[PDB]
Amino acid sequence: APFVAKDIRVDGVQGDLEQQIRASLPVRAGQRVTDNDVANIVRSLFVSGRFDDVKAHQEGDVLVVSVVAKSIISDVKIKGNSIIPTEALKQNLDANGFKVGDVLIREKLNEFAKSVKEHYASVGRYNATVEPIVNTLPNNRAEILIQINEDDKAKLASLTFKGNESVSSSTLQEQMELQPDSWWKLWGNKFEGAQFEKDLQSIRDYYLNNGYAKAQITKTDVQLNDEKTKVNVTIDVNEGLQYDLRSARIIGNLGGMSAELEPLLSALHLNDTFRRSDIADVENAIKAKLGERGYGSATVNSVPDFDDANKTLAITLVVDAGRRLTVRQ
Length: 329
Hints:
Layout lengths: L2 E2 L11 H9 L7 E2 L1 H13 L3 E9 L2 E8 L2 E8 L6 H10 L10 H17 L6 E9 L3 E9 L6 E7 L6 H4 L22 H14 L7 E8 L7 E8 L5 E9 L5 H4 L10 E2 L2 H17 L6 E5 L2 E2 L4 E9 L9
Parallel strand pairs: 5-7, 8-10, 11-15
Antiparallel strand pairs: 1-2, 3-4, 6-7, 9-10, 11-12, 13-15, 14-15
PDB class: transport protein
Keywords: beta-barrel assembly machinery, poly-POTRAs, lipo-partners
Assembly: monomeric
């Protein structure tokens, strides 16, 4: 849709190149320009090889040209490398166009990372990870960082606890199967060794097996290492107040049985420190009991109610019994 380009902005870039883009622009501040002219700019730009993307529209009186330029490589560095010597990894980069000269092509980077993974596997580190990182820098440049873990893991260095008001470090780490100097599989990336999932329970269980029935575990850090041995771990825990059990009131669909279920709240110790494990064993018999009469899908669910103020807690075992059975011969 033709128009007069009073100004001509060029958006993607800085200096160096912003300059040469301008200097080659087939068009002139001031003239009026067709779709066709503008296409000519955009195609000329793409043919250089230098851009992942070029667009061009009118923004009032100015022809704007946005752009996204291939970075060029300032430093290449590798951490975690350890039995493929850096010499050879550096040689590989340099054969695959990741010399410092060069214009980074990002996809070839991931291809390169895959290929190094495949070499680590000809030497039997089938768990290796080779993840490349690109930090971008001004002047249309960037540096490359190849991160390598040749196994996952290495030995666990330190656990550290934050927000543990009342319970000590030393206590919680007896709750945990994972002790220092035992290994710490890190399943690449980002999903805590499976078994550490376990131990976060042990803990939750134990604040709940000892009053603190708000204890949410807040967050968890993992500190790797530069070389990818040793890791430091940090568990952030919010204990909250340490409640007590006053009432133990039941509801819902009990399939008659209210009868013989009410005698079950009884090896409970009302007006004493709350406890999940006790509260559970109730649900267990409640559920065994309902099972006798053929209700063996019955579901208990411990809702609560709080005196934060007066330090106590009101149990509401919502039950219901998934049908009765009746087999008949």
